[PDB]
């Protein structure tokens, strides 16, 4: 009947905490120096240990998750670390005089301009092809002298040609004393109590696929397709969608471009586009209309579960923002594509003929809302073609005072973090507090 | 019977108290200026810092070598009124830590003062002869 406190060291007790995670990737061997894997990420253990926690029920919140905020700052910081040593194209802001590529009734333009040479006193005139988006006319009156789009706002640096932009699986690990809780509930929505929970030291192979509008190469939701949002009632917050069946999308750049290596200084090398060899075709992606119409129908079924079992569900193209947010932007073999998705979100729902999408390309880009530094993607030699998985989406309501009679859904890409949340919805970081004090009928011996 | 790290987190406190070794093991174990290197090194220093703090508390409570140690501090009923069967056969360490997280700091202070600071002086005066 006399109770005394006793210290237990190693009690399964944890508390919500945010710590500094680190990198971990398999032992992939090779060209290399891919930005994300870096020179050294801790190689994944030959065998990971996933330990299911019986009887455990933990509250999750993918929208207040700090793993997202950390990953975001890691991608940004990794990008800058790879641009620092590469060649900066400060002298490439010389006035450009551009002409058309002949044809009657032009996305790319043939530009001639003078560029410095190895020797300070000598100069050289070189001709290189450019895309319309990367250039603006220096007159508007108009004459026809053009300049690079970035020279007015921020400097520019050329991405090194060796580093590759292909995402590889990356595992986010937590330090000793902390742990990661994975929600294995198939039907798990955005937030809430997860009945089935397990613990792991590192996450699964998460590929840092930077996309917009459409989610590519992600992980497929099990069982039914999932509709995740922070506030379905609030139109302002985006809507994450995860497919149970992946749709296939083929993007190609049929032009047989060429790489022109023009030295612009001692050691500095600039890689310009070389006249195209062969026909002049524009890049485009294909999607099977049967699968997409089927996949889009499965989405509207889960959509009605939150907007009434019967309601008008239409789809329109992006009507807000410009440039990145209006086009399904992404990377493919080193070239940055920008596709018009009006053909995919152009339906209305109530109660082998593959779709084609126009894609334009740029070589000067400012990703992640970066203000101050632009990057020049060196031209990729040969024909480019990449087959990717479209696993998720990012939608948004139009809002307004419509009496709930009809609901409209448009794509968007407001923030880059939503891409990370599409793969970090199931994980959570907690710290282990192994000191527990409890009363027992034991007493220390006075001896 | 081993379930793995934190396997008994949903079990009763009595069942979890049997596998404290499991949590004890996995509790500690040209330019290197990469973003990963700075994160890793800072993560490693954070892990040993937390481990040494808990081992520090066990040291000042005279319980360094053991996972289960008994003390001289009596259980003040204001902390919890639950009987032994209700505590050890009806509650998990999680919901227990939540019920007593309020008085943990007070309990830790009594745990370092009441015994091991009194015990060591009395141990010298006892083995003094």
């Amino acid at each position, epitope marked *: 009947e006399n109770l005394w406190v006793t210290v237990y060291y190693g009690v399964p007790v944890w508390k919500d905490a945010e710590t500094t995670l680190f990198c971990a990737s398999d032992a992939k061997a090779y060209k290399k120096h891919n930005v994300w894997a870096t020179h050294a990420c801790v190689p994944t253990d030959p065998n990971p240990q996933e330990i299911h926690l019986e*009887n455990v*029920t*933990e*509250e999750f919140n993918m929208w207040k998750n700090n793993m997202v905020e950390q990953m975001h700052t890691d991608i940004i910081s990794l990008w800058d670390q790879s641009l620092k040593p590469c060649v900066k194209l400060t002298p490439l802001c010389v006035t450009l005089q551009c002409t058309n590529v002949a044809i009657t009734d032009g996305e790319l333009k043939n530009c001639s301009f003078n560029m410095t040479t190895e020797l300070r006193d000598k100069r050289q005139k070189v001709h290189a092809l450019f895309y319309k988006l990367d250039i603006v006319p220096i007159n508007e009156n108009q004459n026809t002298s053009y300049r690079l789009i970035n020279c007015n706002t921020a400097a520019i640096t050329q991405a090194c040609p060796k580093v590759s932009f292909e995402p590889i699986p990356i595992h986010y690990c937590a330090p000793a004393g902390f742990a990661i809780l994975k929600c294995k509930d198939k039907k798990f929505n955005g937030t*809430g*109590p*997860c*009945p089935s929970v397990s613990t792991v030291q590192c996450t699964h192979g998460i590929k840092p696929v930077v996309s917009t509008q459409l989610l590519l190469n992600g992980s497929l939701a099990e069982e039914e397709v999932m509709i995740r949002s922070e506030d379905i009632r609030n139109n302002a917050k985006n809507i994450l969608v995860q497919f149970n069946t992946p749709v296939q999308i083929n993007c190609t750049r049929p032009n047989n471009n060429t790489r022109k290596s023009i030295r612009i200084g001692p050691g500095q090398w600039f890689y310009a586009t070389g006249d195209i060899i062969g026909d002049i075709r524009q890049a485009h992606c294909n999607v099977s209309k049967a699968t997409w119409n089927e996949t889009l129908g499965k989405v509207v079924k889960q959509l009605r579960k939150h907007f009434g079992n019967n309601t008008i569900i239409r789809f329109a193209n992006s009507s807000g923002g410009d440039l990145e947010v209006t086009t399904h932007s992404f990377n493919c073999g080193g070239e940055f594509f920008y596709c018009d998705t009006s053909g995919l979100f152009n339906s209305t729902w109530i109660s082998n003929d593959s779709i084609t999408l126009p894609c334009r390309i740029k070589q000067i880009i400012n990703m992640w809302q970066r203000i101050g530094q632009a990057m020049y993607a060196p031209p990729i030699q040969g024909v480019i073609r990449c087959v990717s998985n479209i696993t998720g989406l990012i939608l948004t309501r139009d809002g307004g005072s419509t009496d709930s009679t009809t609901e409209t859904f448009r794509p968007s890409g407001g923030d880059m973090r939503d891409n990370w949340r599409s793969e970090l919805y199931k994980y959570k970081v907690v710290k282990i507090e192994p000191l527990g004090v409890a009363p027992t009928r034991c007493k220390r011996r006075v001896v | 019977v081993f379930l793995g790290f934190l396997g008994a987190a949903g079990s*009763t406190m*009595g*069942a979890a108290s049997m596998t404290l070794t499991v949590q004890a093991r996995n509790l500690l174990s040209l330019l290197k200026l990469t973003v990963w290197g700075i994160k890793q090194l800072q993560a490693r220093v954070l892990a040993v810092e937390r481990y040494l703090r808990d081992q520090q508390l066990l040291g000042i409570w005279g319980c360094s070598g053991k996972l289960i140690c008994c003390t001289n501090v009596p259980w003040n009923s204001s902390w919890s009124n639950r009987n032994l*069967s*209700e505590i050890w*056969d*009806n509650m998990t360490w*999680l*919901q227990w830590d939540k019920e007593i997280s309020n008085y943990t700091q007070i309990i830790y202070g009594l745990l370092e003062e009441s015994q091991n600071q009194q015990e060591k002086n009395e141990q010298d005066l006892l083995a003094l002869d």
Partner: nanobody
């Protein structure tokens, strides 16, 4: 600190079957046995059986082993430590002496020498068997 709410009273003719429900809240439904006990004027209080929401193991008294079917639904989580659930008992071949009051009851402890012991009881369901 949870409440068990049973279905309303029912009148059934002898020979028919009836299914009583017992909805729970305020605690982890998965962690405690659900017992079923009845009280009639002829036999007094009589324990019928219990069932485990976690494993599904059931133990029926021999007097009801051939006429009682106990089932449970899966818990709907509310918080990390509480959830809502539902248990059912289907009794068939009703007789006049089966008229009485039926109770569902939550077990006492998750572990020990008396885990299933009915501790938290519902408000009771009145069953009348008559032609």
């Amino acid at each position: 600190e949870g409440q068990l709410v049973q279905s309303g009273a029912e009148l059934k003719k002898p020979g028919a079957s009836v299914k009583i429900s017992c909805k729970t809240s305020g605690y982890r439904f998965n962690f405690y046995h659900i017992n079923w006990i009845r009280q009639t004027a002829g036999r007094g209080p009589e324990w019928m059986g219990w069932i485990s929401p976690y494993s599904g193991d059931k133990n029926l008294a021999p007097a009801f082993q051939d006429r009682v079917i106990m089932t449970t639904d899966t818990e709907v989580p509310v918080t990390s430590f509480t959830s809502t659930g539902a248990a059912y008992m289907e009794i068939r071949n009703l007789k006049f002496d089966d008229t009485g009051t039926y109770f569902c009851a939550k077990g006492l402890l998750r572990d020990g020498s008396s885990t299933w012991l009915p501790y938290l009881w519902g408000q009771g369901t009145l069953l009348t068997v008559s032609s």
